[PDB]
């Protein structure tokens, strides 16, 4: 997170911290008591799935207050149309071994209906992203949670404003750019999987997942987020399925 | 140059060079005020004037739903939480 401000404790409760073998891996978004949502590119370079732990209610990585909770994740689900090392189809669904206890600092974020997200939420300008990524471009990971306000742009308007990039991956129907092109604010890499929350009449909804911001705070470039409006039907079909023994299950899309 | 009955639904006209501007009441809008701003309760129009969810029926008026754990009030446009810890709401801000 570059150019943002510190999010007060309890103002960003749907964020989760994913730790593998006691190391920072990626952020995440809690949607219900059992399932958590984060990016898919975070799990390319991993082979020991037993030590994957999600931390909820954490705000300061240095201090241990009583609001912190940790649960083991027993299943990670990625769409079949995703190949590792690619930005397309960057979404992952994880099932905790045991549910979390909802407190004042831990509340889930609603997964909107596809029709509601495609018509009503997609036309709200300022949606907020949060994460524990590097506070400065290729710098040091922040100790406190950082929140950023970014504007949402369509792919058509986003493509023309882009600067001369050596490699421009295709922005499919499952992704959308959001942020500023002046290099002041952008979505970093360390905060990948963070919630791109959108507000509508006193309620907060998940509309995007940070996947790649073309590095961090790059001049003339935006932060491409994964569109969740294209996965609600796919997510819920297997979210209510039986607990298959596969830790990493390649569920067929859609 | 406004005798062709241009203003519709109680509008008032003002003369312009080859043009005709209609000064209409707030209930109508348009160049000729041919649009019924009250009679456009469709779900694509600002979510059908509803807080969380809506469902546009075929012929009759739109019906409004709510997200999981929410029940709509008697007004038909607002949703109230039912569980102790609702979704998408910060408990420290109340």
């Amino acid at each position: 997170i570059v150019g943002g401000k510190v999010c007060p404790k309890g103002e960003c409760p749907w964020q989760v911290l994913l730790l593998v073998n006691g190391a920072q891996l990626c952020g995440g978004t809690l949607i219900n008591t059992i399932w958590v949502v984060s990016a898919a590119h975070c799990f390319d370079k991993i082979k020991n799935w037993r030590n994957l732990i999600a931390v909820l209610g954490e705000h300061d990585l240095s201090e241990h207050d009583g609001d912190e909770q940790s649960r083991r994740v027993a299943q990670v689900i990625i769409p079949s149309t995703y190949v590792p090392g690619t930005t397309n189809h960057d979404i992952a669904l994880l099932r905790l071994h045991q549910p979390v206890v909802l407190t004042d600092h831990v509340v889930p974020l609603c997964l909107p209906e596809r029709t509601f997200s495609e018509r009503t939420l997609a036309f709200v300008r300022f949606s907020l992203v949060s994460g524990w990524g590097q506070l400065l471009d290729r710098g040091a990971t922040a100790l406190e949670l950082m929140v950023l306000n970014v504007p949402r742009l369509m792919t058509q308007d986003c493509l023309q404003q882009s600067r001369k990039v050596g490699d421009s991956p295709n922005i499919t129907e499952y992704m959308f750019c959001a942020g500023y092109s002046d290099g002041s604010k952008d979505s970093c890499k360390g905060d990948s999987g963070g919630p791109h929350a959108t507000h509508y009449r006193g309620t907060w909804y998940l509309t995007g997942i940070v996947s790649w911001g073309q590095g961090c705070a790059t001049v003339g470039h935006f932060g491409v987020y994964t569109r969740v409006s294209q996965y609600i039907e796919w997510l819920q079909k297997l979210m209510r399925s039986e607990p298959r023994p596969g830790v990493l299950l390649r569920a067929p899309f859609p | 140059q406004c005798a062709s009955s241009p203003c519709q639904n109680g509008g008032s006209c003002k003369d312009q060079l080859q043009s005709y501007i209609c000064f209409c009441l707030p209930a109508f809008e348009g160049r000729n005020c041919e649009t019924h701003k009250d009679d456009q309760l469709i779900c694509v129009n600002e979510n059908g004037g509803c807080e969380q969810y809506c469902s546009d029926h075929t012929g009759t008026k739109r019906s409004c739903r709510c997200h999981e754990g929410y029940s709509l009030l008697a007004d038909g446009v607002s949703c109230t939480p039912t569980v102790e810890y609702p979704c998408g709401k910060i408990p420290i801000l109340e």
Epitope: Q98 | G69, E84
Partner: antibody, heavy 122, light 108 residues
């Protein structure tokens, strides 16, 4: 193999307190579940009295929220109900049940108890 | 409170026929509706969850459809063992509400 059964007196005088105890064997109350009490009068009018999920938090039906209390003791693997000021309308068969597909906001009812009939009379 | 109405109150159909049961809701509860069967003297059984997915061990003859306000419960090839009172449960918002019940007397 998860099974549950309720234990009660079978008769409670009106203007008194109604108590019922449900015992669970194949599942742990404090892992992942919402546990509810559902009653049915002889007219078979299924009514959801209330539910208590793990960690002790409770939510009750607003129709009778002022006279119901549901508690549990994790050590004994059982959870009970306390309905006070019972009238003739409370004569019903009370079912102990477990919630299936419980993800917070709402759930279903997959596992049911055998049901115990309670008669309210003087 | 979501008031749920079940119709018809009484239905009498032969085994060779098919039975259609309706479950209207006072609001749009999406697909969050579960169906139950209660044979007399026994606890209800979860037949169909979320109006489309059948449970485990449930015979394939039972099926469901609908979303929003109106829901339907279908028994394709009725059999003599289907005599029971069927219920649909609100599964979207509290207070959790069950149906009135539709008795299904079979002919022979």
């Amino acid at each position: 193999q998860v099974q549950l059964q309720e234990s009660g007196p079978g008769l409670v005088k009106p203007s008194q307190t109604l108590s019922l105890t449900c015992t669970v064997s194949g599942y742990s109350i404090s892992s992942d579940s919402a546990w509810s009490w559902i009653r049915q009068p002889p007219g078979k009018g299924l009514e959801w009295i209330g539910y208590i999920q793990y960690s002790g938090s409770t939510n009750y039906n607003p129709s009778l929220k002022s006279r119901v209390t549901i508690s549990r003791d994790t050590s004994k693997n059982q959870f009970s109900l306390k309905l006070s000021s019972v009238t003739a309308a409370d004569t019903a068969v009370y079912y102990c049940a477990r919630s299936v597909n419980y993800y917070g906001n709402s759930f279903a009812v997959g596992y049911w108890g055998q049901g115990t009939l309670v008669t309210v009379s003087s | 409170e979501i008031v749920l109405t079940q119709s018809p109150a009484t239905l009498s159909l032969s085994p060779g026929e098919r039975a259609t049961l309706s479950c209207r809701a006072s609001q749009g509860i999406s697909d969050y509706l579960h169906w139950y069967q209660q044979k007399p003297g026994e606890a209800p059984r979860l037949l169909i969850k979320y109006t489309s997915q059948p449970a485990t061990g449930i015979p394939a003859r039972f099926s469901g459809s609908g979303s929003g306000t109106d829901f339907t419960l279908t028994i394709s090839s009725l059999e003599p063992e289907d005599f029971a009172v069927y219920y649909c449960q609100n599964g979207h918002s509290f207070p959790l509400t069950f149906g009135q019940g539709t008795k299904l007397e079979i002919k022979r």
